[PDB]
Design a protein around this nucleic acid. Structure first.
Ligand SMILES: [Mg+2]
Ligand SMILES: [Mg+2]
Ligand SMILES: [Mg+2]
Ligand SMILES: [Mg+2]
Ligand SMILES: [Mg+2]
Ligand SMILES: [Mg+2]
Ligand SMILES: [Mg+2]
Ligand SMILES: [Mg+2]
Ligand SMILES: [Mg+2]
Ligand SMILES: [Mg+2]
Ligand SMILES: [Mg+2]
Ligand SMILES: [Mg+2]
Ligand SMILES: [Mg+2]
Ligand SMILES: [Mg+2]
Ligand SMILES: [Mg+2]
Ligand SMILES: [Mg+2]
Ligand SMILES: [Mg+2]
Ligand SMILES: [Mg+2]
Ligand SMILES: [Mg+2]
Ligand SMILES: [Mg+2]
Lengths: 48, 670, 48
RNA sequence: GAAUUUGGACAAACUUGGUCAUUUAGAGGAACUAAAAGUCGUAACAAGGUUUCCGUAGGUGAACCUGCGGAAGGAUCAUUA
RNA sequence: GCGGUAAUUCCAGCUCCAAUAGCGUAUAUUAAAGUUGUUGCAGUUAAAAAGCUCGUAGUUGAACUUUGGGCCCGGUUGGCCG
RNA sequence: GGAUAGUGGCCUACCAUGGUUUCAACGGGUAACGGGGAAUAAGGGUUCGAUUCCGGAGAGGGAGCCUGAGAAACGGCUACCACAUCCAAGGAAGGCAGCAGGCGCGCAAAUUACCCAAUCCUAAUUCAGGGAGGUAGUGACAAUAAAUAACGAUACAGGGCCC
């Protein structure tokens, strides 16, 4: 929390019979690092 | 109700102009902390990442490009901390150069900064074991605004064509840890140097959460006043940054401890600590009074079977009517049918090898026990429990046990951490006598004998940190724990491991568990840290109310840095409700097979032992349930029923559980 | 993860050819040396 | 021929109330949420209603009946001329 | 869409496919969209013919008034010859 | 009639009672400068056009004016409004939507570099001057071209071509 996050669009349609809703955004960046690169252990995260 | 809206050109333009005027005002207010004429203190720390590199030189460049030869010459003589006012941009910098022989001194230096400059070598590649760890650890504990700068670039070929190569490779190395930046600046050129100086002066430094929410003063002058023969008042002249200090709250000082305040004066009024004083005692005497209702004081000595009465059989009563038959020499059977009435390097090496072996053993075979024939299983597990579902049944936190630590009552039992944290931080913000940007004399009470270790504020950094409410009071804390990169080595859950959160460092024998959320808040006790995933480390240690990042390490004298960096993470929770059950698995081989009844072998060795564990469920790693029926032989063989059909390649197992208690922690110095 | 500073260029199983070459490879993986498996052209089979 | 002065057109801007429209910091109060927890009400209680609709009127009630006028969007056997 | 000891459908490796010094993702927009329809939609029952007629602007509006025949002039392609 | 370089309700007197409007006036909206043009479609269209040429408008917001053939000019002046600088507290200066550069803002955009050699402009003028313009730096905005391998022998391994 308190982390800067770059968001984009995301197309998950929500469903009715199970009360799943449709968020419309996916995190693309955290704290200036690409979510992907972190996940690839390619780049590391400056934690402040 | 209310009519609708039809915003005109004018309305729009205005709402805009107002939004932006407000934005601008707020920005000016937030950029007034560095009015470089009277009220500013931009802390820049110089961190070279290469052995064969001089920090004094890096400063020399930055201030020679300010065209001030005097301020350079006056610093060579004797100093390491400087108060440099630049007139070009009108700014008050404070430069700090660390003792590059002490790792922890580097961390302490940077962790107070508003800016971290990184020196990079054009000649020497950064060390994998030292400088790299500087990068990562700084990064984990917290960094404000950082910069990547070079000095050694002229040491390579004289033609720029080759220098720019080194520069760019350094840029791509530096980008890896610090993607916020893409330009490693070259001080050799006047332009880049003038530009980095420019930034340090002008650019506003970002915020590091935990340090900014409790306030901090970097000390310029430290004097001492004798009051009593055995203790006096440390006086500290320094500018306050962050949230500020209150006279009542305690102050931490690194490698010295937590102390309480006596007086504070401002020179930009006088405030003295009164009756609302935070006290210098860990286990508050009110904590003893908070845990008064001891709920379960169960006596495991008054048990004929395993404690599992909630889901098991019924209290079987065995009224023993023993009479003695007097035929000389006679079995217990005949007697049962005569009187029947009806109405230092070697040590470490050997031990460490054994720990690796036990850990890999713990991966291949999790929590299994090996019972011997001579071993009375009952006694050996008499204190244990035998719950069916570990996350459903009713463990409790308030249970009294001789194994429980004496202090357990005297602990700070915060109900809710998320809310208490916010409330107390708002209190501290509102009740702040001394705000950021104030110059302060700080009069702290202090035991005389420690004055010997205190150095000079100009050759060594002297930082003064603020504490919040009850932060001196111990509690049951849960940390998030993740292994450091390239660290395969084993780490058991009882060995001393130093932990740095905030600026405070406490040696800790932490209990490792998996933070998997449970409806009854009961988590498996993991003897050794999991090699892949984030885990949880629980122990009795002073509270932290800003969720500081934590660094886990074990001081190793041999390495350059006198520290082995084990793992990292965060201060998660001030919670006692977390209980930890040491599991204990009993293993047995399914001997013989009948179409519904399976005879099981080598899990006990007495029939009475089998009686004792009747109710306890049997699970097979093939993923199948079952229960015991009755004892076959006088050797502990036991018949059993199950869910599916099991072969001789399966393992029948029992799960028994015990309460595991957090352990007391002591501060760590030097 | 971390390639050290020595990215300074100036002063395992066999690799796959790049560019043109690779296409060539495919042209013979599919048309010069045809592999007819079970009455179909099978791409990426294990044991069959 | 400078300072200065009479009256004009041009006319920024100011003061004042009044008026809508917003930005705000505060206080008044009201209402909604649950990866919150348990408590009763009926959960952990049992069924009953089943031509279906339209406009309209009323009654209410926890729902649903009911008056008047419409519609089939409702299942034509049998005899005979 | 699809399951759980045995999973081609999830996770990791191996393999393979596509475009390749480039490739993915987000928003916008055009095509797809004959789902804006002048070209070119639909309107009994799928969304949709106003309860009904009158009526001004508007759009729209039957047929008919030198056809038919005779003469001459000179062009530009195409053939049979050159 | 006055004013203007000049027609003209442009303004001033005096007369009239007109002028626009369902063929959509008037008002409101535009995250609207207009065009040459751009993207995409078989066609017909739909959607872009702040931006290299043309035309217009502005130089923090308004208004006023000197000089001059030409300005209601802001790298001219004056005042008020908004900001903001130096002061020795009397005063004095200020407009980067020119080139670079900084802050802020944000999803979002480069060097405080070299030169009049081209292009052309200005001047009393062949010479002077020109961040107009040109040259390099940064930059995976785009667009073009196209390295990352070509052979051979050998053997093993097979198929096919004729004896
Ligand atoms: Mg349709
Ligand atoms: Mg219908
Ligand atoms: Mg219908
Ligand atoms: Mg009809
Ligand atoms: Mg006609
Ligand atoms: Mg506009
Ligand atoms: Mg089409
Ligand atoms: Mg345009
Ligand atoms: Mg615009
Ligand atoms: Mg133009
Ligand atoms: Mg103009
Ligand atoms: Mg401006
Ligand atoms: Mg002139
Ligand atoms: Mg002007
Ligand atoms: Mg200008
Ligand atoms: Mg101009
Ligand atoms: Mg500019
Ligand atoms: Mg010249
Ligand atoms: Mg230019
Ligand atoms: Mg490009």
């Amino acid at each position: 929390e308190n982390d800067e996050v770059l968001l984009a669009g995301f197309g998950r349609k929500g469903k009715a019979k199970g009360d799943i809703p449709g968020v419309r955004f996916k995190v693309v960046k955290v704290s200036g690092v690409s979510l992907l690169a972190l996940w690839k252990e390619k780049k590391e995260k400056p934690r402040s | 109700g209310k009519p609708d809206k039809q915003v005109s050109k004018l309305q729009r333009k205005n709402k805009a102009k107002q939004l932006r005027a407000q934005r601008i005002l707020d920005s000016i207010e937030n950029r007034k902390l560095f009015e470089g004429k009277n009220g500013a203190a931009k802390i820049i720390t110089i961190v070279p990442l290469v052995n064969d590199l001089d920090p004094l030189d890096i400063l020399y460049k930055l201030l020679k490009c300010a065209d001030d030869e005097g301020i350079m010459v006056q610093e060579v003589d004797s100093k390491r901390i400087f108060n440099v006012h630049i007139k070009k941009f009108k700014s008050n910098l404070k430069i700090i150069i660390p003792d590059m022989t002490n790792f922890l001194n580097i961390l302490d230096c940077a962790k107070v900064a508003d800016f971290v400059v990184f020196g990079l070598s054009g000649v020497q590649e950064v060390d994998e074991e030292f400088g790299e760890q500087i990068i990562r650890a700084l990064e984990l504990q917290g960094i404000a605004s950082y910069i990547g700068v070079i000095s050694n670039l002229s040491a390579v070929h004289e033609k720029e064509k080759f220098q720019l190569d080194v520069k760019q490779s350094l840029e791509s190395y530096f980008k890896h840890f610090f993607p916020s930046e893409e330009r490693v600046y070259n001080l050799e050129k006047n332009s880049d140097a003038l530009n980095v100086l420019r930034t340090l002066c002008q650019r506003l430094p970002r915020s590091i959460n935990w340090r900014d929410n409790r306030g901090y003063v970097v000390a310029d002058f430290v004097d001492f006043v004798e009051t009593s023969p055995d203790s006096g008042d440390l006086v500290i002249e320094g500018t306050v940054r962050g949230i500020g200090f209150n006279a009542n709250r305690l102050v931490h000082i690194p490698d010295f401890g937590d102390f309480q305040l006596n007086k504070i004066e401002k020179i930009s009024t006088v405030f003295e600590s009164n009756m609302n004083r935070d006290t210098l005692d860990e286990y508050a005497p009110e904590g003893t009074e908070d845990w008064s209702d001891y709920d379960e004081d169960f006596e495991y000595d008054g048990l004929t079977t395993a404690r599992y009465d909630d889901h098991g059989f019924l209290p079987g009563r065995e009224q023993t009517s023993k009479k003695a038959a007097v035929p000389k020499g006679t079995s217990d059977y005949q007697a049962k049918w005569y009187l029947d009435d009806v109405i230092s390097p070697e040590e470490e090496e050997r031990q460490l090898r054994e720990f690796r072996d036990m850990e890999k053993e713990d991966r291949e075979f999790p929590d299994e026990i090996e019972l011997e024939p001579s071993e009375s299983a009952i006694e050996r597990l008499k204190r244990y429990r035998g719950l069916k579902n570990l996350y459903n049944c009713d463990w409790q936190v308030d249970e009294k046990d001789p194994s429980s630590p004496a202090e357990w009552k005297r602990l700070l039992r915060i109900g809710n951490y998320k809310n208490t944290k916010n409330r107390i931080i708002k209190e501290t913000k509102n009740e702040a006598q001394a705000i950021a940007g104030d110059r302060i004399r700080m009069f702290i009470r202090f035991p005389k004998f420690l004055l010997e270790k205190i150095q000079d504020p100009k050759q060594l950094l002297f930082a003064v940190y603020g504490l919040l409410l009850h932060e001196h009071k111990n509690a049951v804390v849960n940390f998030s724990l993740q292994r450091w990169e390239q660290y395969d080595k084993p780490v058991p859950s009882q060995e001393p491991i130093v932990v740095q959160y905030g600026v405070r460092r406490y040696t800790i024998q932490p209990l490792f568990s998996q933070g998997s959320n449970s409806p009854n808040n009961v988590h498996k006790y993991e003897r050794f840290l999991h090699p892949d995933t984030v885990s949880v480390a629980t122990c009795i240690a002073p509270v932290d109310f800003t969720q500081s990042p934590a660094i886990f390490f074990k001081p190793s004298p041999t390495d350059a840095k006198n520290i082995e960096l084990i793992g990292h993470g965060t201060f998660l929770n001030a919670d006692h409700s977390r209980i930890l059950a040491k599991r204990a698995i009993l293993t047995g081989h399914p001997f013989r097979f009948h179409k519904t009844v399976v005879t099981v072998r080598y899990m006990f060795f007495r029939p009475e032992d089998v009686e004792w564990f009747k109710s306890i469920p049997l699970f097979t790693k093939s993923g199948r349930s079952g229960f015991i029926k009755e004892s076959l032989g006088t050797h502990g063989y036991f018949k059993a029923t199950f869910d599916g059909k099991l072969s001789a390649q399966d393992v029948v197992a029992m799960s028994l559980y015990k309460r595991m208690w957090p352990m007391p922690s002591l501060p760590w110095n030097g | 993860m971390a390639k050290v500073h020595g990215s300074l260029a100036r002063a395992e199983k066999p690799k796959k050819p790049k560019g043109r070459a690779y296409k060539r490879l495919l042209y013979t993986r599919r048309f010069v040396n045809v592999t007819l498996v079970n009455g179909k052209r099978r791409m990426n089979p294990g044991p069959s």
